[PDB]
Design a protein around this nucleic acid. Structure first.
Ligand SMILES: [Mg+2]
Ligand SMILES: [Zn+2]
Lengths: 162, 726
DNA sequence: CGAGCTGTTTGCTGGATGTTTATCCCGGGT
DNA sequence: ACCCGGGATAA
RNA sequence: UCCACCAAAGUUAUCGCUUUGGUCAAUUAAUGCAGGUAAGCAACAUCCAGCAAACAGA
């Protein structure tokens, strides 16, 4: 299971790092796409992508590296790919899953859950967990607003694989 | 070698340099205005003279030279060398100035200062002359025949004779024979008499009709004789001597309350139309140059405005012999580039041969052209299980047209619709002086607002077309963001959301700021907003961030953005052509995929005349496009092809009753007989279970194509049409 | 082929003809 | 004297 | 005043029929096809006669 890390900077000041554990064996294609975006193998990735939608106590979202507002993003396999599987569910906080605009509309955007989301089971593919830096995740969440607007410019300054 | 010309379409924004965009726009508008007046004023002159005196020499004034003077009279410029004018030019200018002041007063028009208007006037006046000649040559004979029928009182005589004979209990066949003997034959005699300029024999027409005929013939010269003894042939041979007569014909048509027809071509579209641009026009109007541009510097001048190295402007055609010659046509949004090879310096399947018919074995595609189903296509090898059937419907082609029509209907301002309704109270095709003057005044009273609305793409917009209107964003099921009806972008991360109905109400309005920020970053939205408006919108967005719950900021933003609700009519018109081309190519690709690349097409002989309660059809354009793509196309008669059951050659009937297909007519006419489903009269027609008969049911198009296949097989076997379908 | 009487704007379909470039010189200014 | 428009004509 | 395409069934080569599965560039964006990066192809303005939508009047 590949592990990846993001460096989060608010208003140009680093605030911490978050370490993720990927379900490579359970969800191969989605995990591979996420790893490629993290490492920027294909010339594009989450590097510099902003967290355009953070809802406190509910979720953080990001991964839009072409528009920074949720209307962009693309996968290595193309614009979008079909849902792979739902062998994992939003059962515990800290789960990393793919954001989509409906069935078979997965792209590059991802979201991290801060509370259980049983109602989202079967709708969004869950493909990772947060193993370290969850305090940094809470710190980022504290900068969010109920409407999703961020109190400060939060971006993934750097990304990589451990 | 012969001369051929090709046109390449494109958009101004894609090839036109930004710094020179504004000079072009105004020019277009100016030209359009002049052209519009160049029509109306011209008519305003003729109707003025013809009503003033019947001896007026109207025929000689239908020329490009007179139209050029008419066009120039609407443009104010410094006086030239008057003594160098020709006698014809002097007479034309005097005639124009006779009514110049009256026309300006009636139309509330002022001359537009436009230097170097010679070339534009020449081109537009050549177009006007061509339009006049084409209209007359096309419709003079038909309108003359209609007038002759009206003069003979054919309808009244036929009705009276039919009623009289029915009162006497005459058989319908005898009634028709008597009508032919007593009505149609004298009418043909009158037609023959009029065609040769000779008055009809006494008793065929009453005194009033004879007087009207004499008045009509007084238009022509007394000694003038129609070429080859036929007026209809002389009109084509020597059109210039009939124009005045045509006008009189129109009046006679209006004498008997016949539906008015446009005798004088006019430009009435408020949307700016295409105008021709050449090297001189570009040099003197767009580039604002002040010196003569020679042919050697021809392409250099264009290079300063457009990139001649693009795909559109490069060589094209066989051996790349079709080169661009510095001539374009543009209407402010779209552009057409003309290429030419020379310098500017001045069948039925039943009648096919044996080999031709037998070479199509296993490749013919039988098509049934319908109204709603444009093409129902079936291949020879089609069977009950191997259903090699294709359907190209009217909906597929009309998607974009219906979408644009609905959008225009929904986005039409109240002022625009009211102005159109008011302007519709005055007829335009009528040749009456008073009616035309009233129409001119009515158009002048509403021309400004209509031009502003339809010219919103490049013209100044001031009027508030949507007062007291608040616009709120919405998201559809497909996560597409629309302001009210304007597409913004697809939100790919919209579905992830928490439990609905949060505690704080103001978040719903706060999402408005996020939607506005997403919208304002779009190119097609940012380009439509000027710097000052964008600054004000950003300030209002900041204020909304300060006080999201306040609706005043939202109302102000809606008022500012009301410009975005104006439709780009010219852009939609341009996109319609692309949509039509894409539909044609998609149909060709589908035909080749389903029926193979070397498929042979057999189309029905139905002509599809334009009928009331029915939308137009591409019957002729469809065949032309199919032939242009290389498909071998042949025509097969549809006589009794859709009336007999293929399984047993028995007649079919319309049995099922269904609610009205059109929902709006259900309340008035709820239920009607079905049209696409039929049942056979054999009453077994199948291995029926005998429970309720269960007659074999056939789709009308499927039965028609099966009968076409039967006819084709019979032709192949015996080279003769089937006796049943003969 | 298939569905139930007038005017404008739009558009969709159909029919007809074209798709510029030198040269002169008078008004006006310096 | 010498030049800068800009209308008007014509193939 | 409404209807984008491809398939299964009621069903029998069954409708502007109904019930299901699959597809989506949504568009008030842009010269359109394809080739994968080269290299080829594609008639347009005006006017007029009809027909459809909105409105208003017979
Ligand atoms: Mg037919
Ligand atoms: Zn039968």
């Amino acid at each position: 299971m590949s592990q990846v890390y993001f460096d989060v900077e608010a208003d140009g000041q680093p605030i911490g790092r978050v370490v993720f554990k990927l379900y490579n064996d359970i969800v191969p294609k989605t995990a591979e796409n996420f790893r490629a975006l993290c490492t920027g193998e294909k010339g594009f990735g989450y590097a510099g992508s902003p967290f355009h939608r953070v809802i406190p106590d509910f979720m953080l979202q990001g991964g839009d590296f072409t528009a920074g507002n949720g209307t962009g993003g693309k996968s290595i396999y193309g614009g979008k790919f079909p849902d792979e599987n739902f062998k994992k569910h939003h059962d515990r906080p800290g789960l990393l899953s793919m954001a989509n605009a409906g069935p078979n509309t997965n792209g590059s955007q991802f979201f991290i859950t801060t509370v259980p989301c049983p109602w989202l089971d079967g709708k969004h593919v869950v493909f990772g967990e947060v193993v370290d830096g969850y305090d940094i995740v809470k710190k980022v969440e504290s900068l969010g607003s109920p409407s999703g607007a961020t109190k400060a410019r939060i971006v993934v300054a750097k990304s990589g694989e451990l | 070698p012969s001369k051929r010309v090709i046109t390449i379409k494109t958009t101004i924004k894609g090839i036109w340099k930004y710094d020179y965009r504004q000079p072009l726009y105004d020019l277009v508008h100016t030209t359009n205005l002049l052209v519009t007046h160049t029509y109306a004023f011209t008519k305003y002159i003729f109707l003025k003279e013809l009503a003033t005196d019947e001896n007026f020499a109207f025929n000689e004034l239908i020329t490009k030279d007179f139209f050029v003077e008419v066009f120039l009279s609407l443009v104010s410029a410094k006086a030239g060398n008057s003594e160098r004018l020709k006698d014809t030019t002097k007479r034309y200018r005097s005639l124009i100035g006779k009514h110049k002041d009256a026309y300006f007063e009636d139309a509330k028009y002022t001359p537009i200062s436009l230097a170097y208007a010679q070339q534009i006037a020449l081109y537009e006046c050549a177009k006007v002359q061509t339009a006049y000649f084409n209209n007359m040559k096309a419709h003079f004979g038909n309108r003359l025949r209609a007038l002759i029928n009206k003069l003979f009182k054919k309808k009244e005589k036929v009705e009276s004779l039919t009623k009289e004979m029915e009162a006497n209990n005459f058989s319908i066949k005898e009634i028709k024979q008597a009508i032919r003997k007593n009505v149609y034959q004298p009418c043909n005699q009158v037609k023959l008499a009029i065609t040769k300029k000779n008055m009809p024999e006494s008793g065929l027409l009453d005194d009033k009709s004879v007087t009207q005929l004499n008045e009509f013939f007084s238009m022509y010269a007394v000694d003038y004789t129609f070429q080859k003894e036929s007026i209809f042939y002389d009109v084509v041979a020597n059109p210039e001597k009939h124009f005045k007569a045509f006008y009189k014909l129109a009046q006679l048509s209006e004498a008997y309350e016949v539906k008015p027809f446009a005798c004088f071509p006019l430009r009435r579209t408020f949307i700016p139309c295409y105008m021709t641009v050449d090297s001189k026009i570009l040099n003197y109007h767009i580039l604002k140059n002040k010196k003569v541009l020679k042919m050697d510097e021809k392409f250099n001048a264009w290079g300063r405005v457009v990139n001649l190295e693009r795909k559109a402007f490069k060589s094209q055609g066989c051996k790349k012999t079709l080169h661009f010659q510095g001539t374009l046509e543009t209407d402010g949004v779209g552009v057409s580039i003309l290429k030419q090879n020379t310098d500017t310096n001045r069948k039925y399947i039943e009648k096919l041969e044996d080999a031709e018919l037998k070479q199509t074995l296993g490749k013919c595609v039988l098509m049934d052209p319908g109204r709603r189903d444009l093409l129902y296509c079936m291949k020879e090898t089609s069977r009950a299980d191997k259903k090699e059937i294709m359907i190209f419907t009217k909906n597929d082609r009309s998607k974009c047209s219906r979408h644009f029509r609905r959008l225009r209907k929904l986005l039409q301002p109240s002022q625009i619709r009211e102005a159109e309704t008011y302007l519709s109270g005055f007829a335009t095709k009528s040749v009456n002086m008073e009616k035309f003057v009233e129409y001119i005044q009515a158009r002048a009273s509403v021309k400004d607002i209509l031009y502003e609305y339809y010219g919103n793409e490049t013209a100044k917009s001031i009027t508030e077309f949507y007062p007291e209107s608040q616009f709120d964003f919405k998201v559809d099921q497909k996560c597409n963001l629309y302001y009210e009806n304007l597409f913004v972008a697809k939100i790919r991360g919209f579905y992830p959301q928490p439990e609905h109905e949060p505690n704080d109400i103001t978040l719903k309005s706060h999402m408005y700021h996020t939607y506005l920020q997403i919208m304002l970053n779009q190119k097609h939205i940012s380009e439509r907003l000027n710097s000052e408006k964008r600054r004000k919108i950003e300030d209002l967005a900041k204020a909304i961030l300060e006080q999201p719950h306040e609706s005043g900021h939202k109302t102000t933003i809606s008022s500012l953005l009301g410009k975005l609700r104006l439709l780009p009519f010219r852009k939609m018109k341009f996109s319609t052509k692309l949509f039509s081309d894409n539909n044609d190519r998609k149909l060709v690709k589908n035909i080749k995929k389903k029926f193979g690349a070397d498929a042979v097409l057999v189309l029905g002989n139905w002509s599809a005349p334009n009928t009331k309660y029915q939308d137009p059809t591409r019957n002729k354009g469809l065949r032309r496009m199919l032939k242009k793509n290389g498909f071998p196309l042949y025509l097969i008669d549809e006589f009794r092809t859709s009336s007999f059951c293929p399984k047993c050659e028995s007649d079919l009937e319309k049995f099922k009753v269904i609610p009205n297909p059109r929902p709006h007519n259900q309340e008035k006419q709820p239920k009607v007989l079905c049209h696409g489903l039929l049942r056979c009269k054999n009453m077994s027609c199948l291995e029926q279970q005998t429970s309720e008969g269960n007659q074999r049911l056939w789709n009308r198009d499927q039965a028609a194509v099966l009968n076409f296949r039967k006819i084709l097989n019979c032709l192949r076997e015996t080279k003769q049409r089937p006796p049943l379908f003969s």
